[PDB]
Amino acid sequence: SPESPLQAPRVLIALLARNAAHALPTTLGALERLRHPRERTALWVATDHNMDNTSTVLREWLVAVKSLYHSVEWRPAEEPRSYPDEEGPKHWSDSRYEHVMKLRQAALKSARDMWADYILFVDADNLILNPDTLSLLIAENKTVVAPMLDSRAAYSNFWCGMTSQGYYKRTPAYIPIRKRDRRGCFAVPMVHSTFLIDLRKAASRNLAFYPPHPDYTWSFDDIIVFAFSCKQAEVQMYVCNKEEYGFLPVPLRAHSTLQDEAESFMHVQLEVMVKHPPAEPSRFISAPTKTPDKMGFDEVFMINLRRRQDRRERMLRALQAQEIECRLVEAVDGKAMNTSQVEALGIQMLPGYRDPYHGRPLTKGELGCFLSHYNIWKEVVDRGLQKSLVFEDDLRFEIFFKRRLMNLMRDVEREGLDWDLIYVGRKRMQVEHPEKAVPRVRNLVEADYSYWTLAYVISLQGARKLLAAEPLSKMLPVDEFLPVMFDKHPVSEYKAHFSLRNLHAFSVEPLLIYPTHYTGDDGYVSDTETSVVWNNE
Amino acid sequence: RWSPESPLQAPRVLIALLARNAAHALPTTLGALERLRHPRERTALWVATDHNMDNTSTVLREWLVAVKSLYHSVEWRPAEEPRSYPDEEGPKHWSDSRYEHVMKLRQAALKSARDMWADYILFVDADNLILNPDTLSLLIAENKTVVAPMLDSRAAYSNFWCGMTSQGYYKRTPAYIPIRKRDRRGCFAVPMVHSTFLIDLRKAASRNLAFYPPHPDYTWSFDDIIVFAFSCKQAEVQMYVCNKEEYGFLPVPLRAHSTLQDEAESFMHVQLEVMVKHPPAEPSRFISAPTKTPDKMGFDEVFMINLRRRQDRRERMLRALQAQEIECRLVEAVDGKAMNTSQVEALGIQMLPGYRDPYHGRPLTKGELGCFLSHYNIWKEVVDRGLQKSLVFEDDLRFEIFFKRRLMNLMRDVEREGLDWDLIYVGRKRMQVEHPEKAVPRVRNLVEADYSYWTLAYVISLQGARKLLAAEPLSKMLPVDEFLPVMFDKHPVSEYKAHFSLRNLHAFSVEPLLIYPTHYT
């Protein structure tokens, strides 16, 4: 006579949301798809001080999901829409700290009063991609445990050290934990943003988000107060990094903007789509339509091989997320060309070239890569495009890419700089000393020896200069042909074949675009280096 | 870095209490629930009362007012009118409308427990006395989905069946008596448990249990405990009963045409059964039971023989008599062991020549002497005061249910019929059981007394007291439980009766017996 399985533990998900409408469709979409039984899950949502339609998005989602969960608590407040003592929407004044602390205490009291086993705090911009995160956190059997969320930088939802006054302290252990070099659940003095409290443990009764502990003497900060509360309760905060759990945006400054926040979370979605499928939104919420543009450029090109469908879709998704429209140029497959078609185009390798690394001659793929860029150069001159931006099909976008690239071009044109080529993504080779800065143009340098063609801006003058050199009779890899044309290539023999090397080439500083996969990374694809010489099979 | 985790809090249990016409039992029943050794912050109360002819809701609300702050939550669902079901024949009749309402109530408590995320729901009938404060913990420890504690009763009845007739009817199996008697201890799979039981709402199969409506496949009678039992079978939830130790007591259900007073006295007998081997079940700190006032049951006097060194027997008997509203005159027993031979000779006491123990052939003991002298002094007092009818008690006896009413009705019938009587056994050891004792015509529940072997309790008339004294039994001392059978000429040893010339005692016995011994040696 067997006893049935136990039901899953009872969890209350507590969600405080202020100015989160940009993130809720994806964040709430992740939460609703958690692999934890919904009848064993309850929802506690509090929103207030919203300058956007956060209240409406939450209400639309709650009405659609209410009948699926154990219970829903909904605490909206439409007015006021900003704190009276705030300096901005991203400023954390004492009134904001006190209110947030009281909300988490209210959510904790709710979880206790409803006899829940756990309360799960998730910040409205924290994306829990792993549906097993809640189950995994429960399995660790801790009183307070947080999953380590990834960010674009070293930031994460934990500290490895804390001073005697509650300030952050960096320890050597932080980096290996952050990079998942050491995997496990580590005792840390601080966790926040997303963490799990075990309300079955007797010691959890002594935890409080508000008021501060009677012996508290530190700053009126919400996460420090709770950390000190676990200290007095003798409750050890833990962070677990045993696998990927989710992603979170790096917090902004007090004087930042709501657009900075919205674009920052968009970068989280971009970072997810680097090595994961896109994080889908909730099927009960619709994100607002986006209007793509060309960022003021005359044209935006995207070189993509017709067979690389995965790259095309990832790039088209990334560009649509950033409201950027491109012209999809079908790349020239160098492997598909036979020797006769190469001769039909009159293509001859530069006499004596060898790969700077393994010494192999020009490959068929490198030939096609050069031809695709060359064809875009012709189209720039044919259409008379003053400024055009060229993309490859495997690049990772930096945060605030669109605004930062538009601001750079605006500064370039305002100073009347005579430019031919502007690197957006490259491999800088002169690293012993900084490259020469461009006067009166911030974030721009004179390009020294470089070695990539991920992304760049090209002028009509610069397009003519490349075609004028007629590189087809002396073809090099395009990422080496350019440093020849602005006279930075180390091999003097290569530059000797090119009589005029007057190209004006610059680079963004810091770079705005990096490769998605590097050599040796899982999934790295280099159709240029397919070990196939251009001359013949 | 090892860091210990604090203990887990106790499981969260909702105690569901349905109360109708239960004011007589609540002060003791609710007091037992208070003192359950389980954290009250992990306990919730669900109480529903309705169709009350007594002050049940008043008693309940005063108790809840006094304990509300100690519990996780309290739900209160009273309904003053109507005070009786429109289809009921009486307050103890289980009509279909009463069955339906009680099923819906238990379903409401079950839904309430699920909605508050309790671990367990414990049902306790308002008349069930959970004397063992660890009962809740022990039931949780068995890790069953539906488990009930075997509560004790005055009879074979308990809160469980061992067999079922595939049509919902009760069925007797050979395993019932061993479980009921605690000859076999443990937790046993059974087709039916009721009254007080514990449901484990952590188990996945508990989601399919339902008190109402009946399961779609239900084809049996509209009975509440059958419907829930069938719900467990369809959910593949095995019902269990545990008897590993004593947990509590419950009255035996009455008949449809019984009265509220019948129920009140029935639960009072439950308290008597508790006091046999336990201290009296204490009431609530906040509820007081109504004061009782004892009488002499219409007798001219009620005696109770007790030796002063037997303080426990004295206190237990007085508690038993007070509960039954019976007042008595305490008579200090003669301690025959303390009597020296000089005091024995001063009273002219001589054993009946040739007496031998019917089981060990031993002479008359000093203890039997003192016991005889105790009854002898009462007979003497009966004749001095002229008491027409007196009731005589010893100090180690267990009372039957409805004792007071059952004895007073017999005496009324005896007087109505003008029966000439000297001795009426209220408790004895019937030795002639091969053929039935001759019934007394026109007097119900009374028979002619044949050979008997005890003197636990008897009614004696002034005429009867005169006859016993006239025999001069001190010169022919014989155990009192044998001297009486000699006097109504039913003693087997004709040589013993030869020493007594006149043996004209009119003896009768109540049938069935209203008083039995406690240890029943």
Ligand SMILES: O=c1ccn([C@@H]2O[C@H](COP(=O)(O)OP(=O)(O)O[C@H]3O[C@H](CO)[C@H](O)[C@H](O)[C@H]3O)[C@@H](O)[C@H]2O)c(=O)[nH]1
């Ligand atoms: O008035 C408010 C203020 C904030 N929030 C909510 O509180 C969470 C945190 O707000 P932010 O997303 O702006 O937080 P940051 O990215 O700036 O980093 C945060 O990291 C910790 C998270 O616990 C602390 O809350 C810290 O104060 C805070 O800066 C969010 O779910 C937000 O929606 C509200 O609901 N109402």
Ligand SMILES: O=c1ccn([C@@H]2O[C@H](COP(=O)(O)OP(=O)(O)O[C@H]3O[C@H](CO)[C@H](O)[C@H](O)[C@H]3O)[C@@H](O)[C@H]2O)c(=O)[nH]1
């Ligand atoms: O209208 C009503 C009728 C009954 N009850 C309650 O339900 C329980 C039934 O106990 P009773 O003493 O009144 O009835 P029984 O002694 O006959 O014992 C009962 O034991 C089972 C308990 O599961 C079933 O209720 C069954 O119908 C019945 O025999 C009690 O707690 C009673 O207070 C109510 O609350 N409201």
Ligand SMILES: O=c1ccn([C@@H]2O[C@H](COP(=O)(O)OP(=O)(O)O)[C@@H](O)[C@H]2O)c(=O)[nH]1
């Ligand atoms: O024969 C080829 C191979 C690639 N490409 C394109 O040129 C760029 C080179 O990217 P890839 O990652 O394949 O080469 P690598 O970055 O390794 O030099 C991409 O836009 C490709 O679509 C091309 O035009 N012809």
Ligand SMILES: [Ca+2]
């Ligand atoms: Ca945030």
Ligand SMILES: [Ca+2]
């Ligand atoms: Ca009952």
Ligand SMILES: [Cl-]
């Ligand atoms: Cl709602």
Ligand SMILES: [Cl-]
């Ligand atoms: Cl990093």
Ligand SMILES: [Cl-]
């Ligand atoms: Cl920090």
Ligand SMILES: [Cl-]
């Ligand atoms: Cl009848």
Ligand SMILES: [Cl-]
């Ligand atoms: Cl009738």
Ligand SMILES: [Cl-]
């Ligand atoms: Cl009848």
Ligand SMILES: [Mn+2]
């Ligand atoms: Mn590449």
Ligand code: NA
């Ligand atoms: Na009748």
